[PDB]
């Protein structure tokens, strides 16, 4: 855990609200689910 070798989940104040979620995906959620099941040989 020395020098931040181990991951820690304490709140980071300076990075809080650093960005706002913006989403631009055309494919609909039902279409997304069907595609991932169909990915590759699956």
């Amino acid at each position: 855990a020395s020098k931040g070798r181990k991951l820690r989940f304490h709140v980071l104040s300076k990075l809080l609200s650093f960005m706002a979620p913006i989403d631009h995906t055309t494919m609909n959620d039902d279409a997304r689910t069907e595609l991932y099941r169909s990915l590759f040989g699956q």
Binding site: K6, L7, R8, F9, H10
Partner: peptide
């Protein structure tokens, strides 16, 4: 607890 990973639920 500092190493416990939080869990999320699919909405």
């Amino acid at each position: 607890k500092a190493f416990i990973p939080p869990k999320e639920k699919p909405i």
